[PDB]
Design a protein around this nucleic acid. Structure first.
Ligand SMILES: [Mg+2]
Ligand SMILES: [Mg+2]
Ligand SMILES: [Mg+2]
Ligand SMILES: [Mg+2]
Ligand SMILES: [Mg+2]
Ligand SMILES: [Mg+2]
Ligand SMILES: [Mg+2]
Ligand SMILES: [Mg+2]
Ligand SMILES: [Mg+2]
Ligand SMILES: [Mg+2]
Ligand SMILES: [Mg+2]
Ligand SMILES: [Mg+2]
Ligand SMILES: [Mg+2]
Ligand SMILES: [Mg+2]
Ligand SMILES: [Mg+2]
Ligand SMILES: [Mg+2]
Ligand SMILES: [Mg+2]
Ligand SMILES: [Mg+2]
Ligand SMILES: [Mg+2]
Ligand SMILES: [Mg+2]
Ligand SMILES: [Mg+2]
Ligand SMILES: [Mg+2]
Ligand SMILES: [Mg+2]
Ligand SMILES: [Mg+2]
Ligand SMILES: [Mg+2]
Ligand SMILES: [Mg+2]
Ligand SMILES: [Mg+2]
Ligand SMILES: [Mg+2]
Ligand SMILES: [Mg+2]
Ligand SMILES: [Mg+2]
Ligand SMILES: [Mg+2]
Ligand SMILES: [Mg+2]
Ligand SMILES: [Zn+2]
Lengths: 69, 181, 23, 83, 123
RNA sequence: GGCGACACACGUGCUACAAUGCCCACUACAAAGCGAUGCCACCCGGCAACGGGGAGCUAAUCGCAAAAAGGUGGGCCCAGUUCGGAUUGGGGUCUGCAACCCGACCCCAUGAAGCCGGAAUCGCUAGUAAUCGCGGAUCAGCCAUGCCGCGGUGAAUACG
RNA sequence: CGCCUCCUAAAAGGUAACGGAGGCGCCCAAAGGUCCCCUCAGGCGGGACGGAAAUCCGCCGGAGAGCGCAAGGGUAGAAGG
């Protein structure tokens, strides 16, 4: 590598909100992150968050079969 | 060389699985990473702010490697482009620095992507290489909102020894590339 | 403002009550 | 919308036409002036001719459009544009 | 991108700052801070990362926001068009959907006035 | 079904572009009217529109009722904002045989134009103008920001 | 009306007509000397903004690119970068 022009990569530890910790190399010694692979909804199982809905509609409507027979 | 989590994972976890999936007879037949090439298409810096060392330095922060410039191959009237104008930054990552960059990319960068729901299964070379495009550079851990003048995106080329799409996909998948389908 | 239903002043203007203007 | 304390509304004189059909084995084209009726799960697969004020507009009904009125699918005015 | 996908403005209060997220009005702001126990009056600059992640974790899991909400709103409009009710037809031509008059006004939906020649008078 | 259309054009208005302001809480001071399948005290369920209860009054007695600007306390800090509240998604409520075309509300979310308006043009000489709320007639409900009224606060200027 | 290129020109050179077609009257301090290194246009496939065409990756691609300007000759085993 060329002297003088590159930034040093040093041992570094990246920390996520989910308490995840990543041992890697960076220009910065310590870095704090909002999300990571370990806790990201798409990555973790299928952690479908708020939306179980699919979607619901339309005739989950029901409520009911009250109109007479 | 040094120990990086993703590199070790390739040798002890990914390599045996690939032999299992595809049954290579030679230890070299099995897929490898050759290099990763990053490109900031830019040209927003063609005339205005005729030099953006900012994009270079910030790209230098992410990769640990100072990018080299790319200049226009020909003049183009419509793009307001004169031949030889500085209109891009490209950096070629090999060996350890490739692993380290791919490692953070898979672990933190891609998850930071807005409304991210996996990569594109169709973006494969046909010849067993892959490309993906980013629109924001703040997606990387060592780049923050405070340090940025404007959003710059990039193009990423991951180049493998695999002959085919099928082999390269298994490699990138086994390594931890999250695909939408 | 008076055209904002989601406020006290607005509910007054429209002469109605609710969460934002109780009685 | 209609208070759910009250019942979901259909004219009954149209519903009975549909239900009699369900038994004998559907279908038949159904002529109705009940734009005001709600679309109801028993109506799926049918085609009901809503009257827009001038003509009976054939309307095929599927699940994606259950919660609506029949008149919602037979627009009363014709526009095309200006000039 | 602090939370949810957006960077809420420092030097303003949390209850206000949360509103800058697509999907949080003032009402959901008050309730989220109560439910996680953070002062509504504390400047964003002055939050412990403990407060930050606690507030963050709640907000993203409790409600669907930003892109996902926009997508869900988009699917709804798309549904109306495809069926396609009168409501759906209105979205096609970009007219009002809720029974407003169109002889005048409606500029928010219709956009800027495209002036056109009128009818001439005699001499 | 339509009178509710919409590339457009005009009139009369409503709401604003903000700090002499906006918001939340607390606390005052009117007048003229209306009211027996009517006004509805108060209790409880609902964040709420409302709903179930349920007294009083044929009403200078009972109720619509809180007047609002104001006053007190705190928040916002000049930002298309805690200014503005259009538009749109979703979920509810009530009248009604029935709210698709085409009702008014309530709630969550959305949070557009608008930074004081070209040529031009309107009203008002005092409790007036400005500003603030209240009632009624029509009426099941209501597209009333309209109309006819009622008080609260309260100017500037007229040489000629 | 002088000069350059092609054809006419009859496979050496040369060869005319108010024959058929173009160009020159400059330019470059690097566009010159030398050493070292490098290889095109185009096509398909892949890739944020990004397009027929900017920059990035892969495969094919002997020269169809380029060599300041006309044309011809030459030329990547370089005269091109
Ligand atoms: Mg190194
Ligand atoms: Mg082997
Ligand atoms: Mg493919
Ligand atoms: Mg390959
Ligand atoms: Mg970052
Ligand atoms: Mg407001
Ligand atoms: Mg049945
Ligand atoms: Mg918001
Ligand atoms: Mg209309
Ligand atoms: Mg009329
Ligand atoms: Mg008006
Ligand atoms: Mg009355
Ligand atoms: Mg704005
Ligand atoms: Mg603007
Ligand atoms: Mg606002
Ligand atoms: Mg709606
Ligand atoms: Mg209606
Ligand atoms: Mg200003
Ligand atoms: Mg003003
Ligand atoms: Mg006078
Ligand atoms: Mg005012
Ligand atoms: Mg009134
Ligand atoms: Mg009425
Ligand atoms: Mg209306
Ligand atoms: Mg010869
Ligand atoms: Mg000779
Ligand atoms: Mg030369
Ligand atoms: Mg040289
Ligand atoms: Mg291509
Ligand atoms: Mg760009
Ligand atoms: Mg050539
Ligand atoms: Mg030339
Ligand atoms: Zn994580």
């Amino acid at each position: 590598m060329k002297e003088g022009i590159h930034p040093k990569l040093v041992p570094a530890r990246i920390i996520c909100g989910c308490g995840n910790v990543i041992e890697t190399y960076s220009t910065k010694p310590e870095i704090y992150v909002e999300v990571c692979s370990k806790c990201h909804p798409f990555y973790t199982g299928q952690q479908r968050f708020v939306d179980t809905e699919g979607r619901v509609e339309r005739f989950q409507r029901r409520y009911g079969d009250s109109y007479r027979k | 060389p040094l120990d990086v989590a993703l590199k070790r994972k390739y040798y002890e976890e990914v390599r045996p699985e690939l032999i299992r999936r595809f049954g290579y007879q030679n230890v070299w037949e099995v897929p490898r990473l050759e290099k990763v090439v990053i490109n900031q298409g830019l040209g927003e810096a063609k005339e205005d702010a005729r030099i953006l060392e900012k994009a270079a330095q910030e790209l230098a922060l992410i990769t640990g490697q100072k990018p080299a410039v790319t200049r226009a191959k020909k003049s183009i009237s419509n793009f307001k482009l004169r031949k030889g104008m500085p209109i891009g930054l490209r950096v070629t990552l090999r060996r350890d620095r490739m692993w380290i960059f791919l490692e953070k990319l898979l672990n933190v960068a891609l998850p930071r992507i807005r409304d991210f729901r996996g990569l594109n299964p169709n973006s494969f070379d046909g010849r067993g290489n892959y490309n993906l495009g980013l629109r924001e550079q703040l997606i990387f851990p060592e780049i923050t909102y405070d340090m940025v003048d404007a959003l710059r995106g990039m193009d990423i080329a991951v180049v493998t020894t695999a002959e085919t799409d099928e082999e390269a996909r298994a490699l990138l998948e086994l390594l931890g590339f999250p695909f939408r389908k | 403002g008076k055209g904002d239903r989601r406020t006290r002043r607005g509910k007054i203007w429209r002469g109605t009550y609710g969460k934002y203007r109780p009685r | 919308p209609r208070s759910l304390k009250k019942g979901v509304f259909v004219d009954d004189h149209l519903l009975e036409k549909v239900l009699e059909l369900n038994a004998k084995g559907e279908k038949r084209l159904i002529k109705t002036w009940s734009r005001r009726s709600t679309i109801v799960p028993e109506m799926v697969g049918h085609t009901i001719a809503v009257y827009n004020g001038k003509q009976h507009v054939p309307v095929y009904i599927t699940e994606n459009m259950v919660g609506h009125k029949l008149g919602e699918f037979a627009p009363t005015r014709t526009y095309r544009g200006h000039g | 991108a602090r939370i949810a996908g957006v960077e809420i403005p420092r030097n303003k209060r949390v209850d206000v700052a949360l509103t800058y997220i697509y999907g949080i009005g003032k009402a959901r702001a008050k309730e989220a801070l109560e439910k996680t126990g953070i002062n509504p009056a504390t400047r964003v600059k002055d939050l412990t990362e403990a407060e930050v992640v606690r507030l963050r974790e709640y907000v993203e899991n409790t409600w669907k926001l930003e892109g996902e909400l926009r997508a869900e709103v988009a699917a709804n409009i798309k549904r109306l068009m495809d069926i396609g009710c009168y409501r759906g037809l209105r979205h096609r031509r970009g007219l009002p959907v809720r029974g407003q008059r169109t002889r005048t006004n409606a500029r928010t939906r219709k956009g800027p006035r495209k002036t056109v020649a009128g009818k001439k008078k005699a001499p």
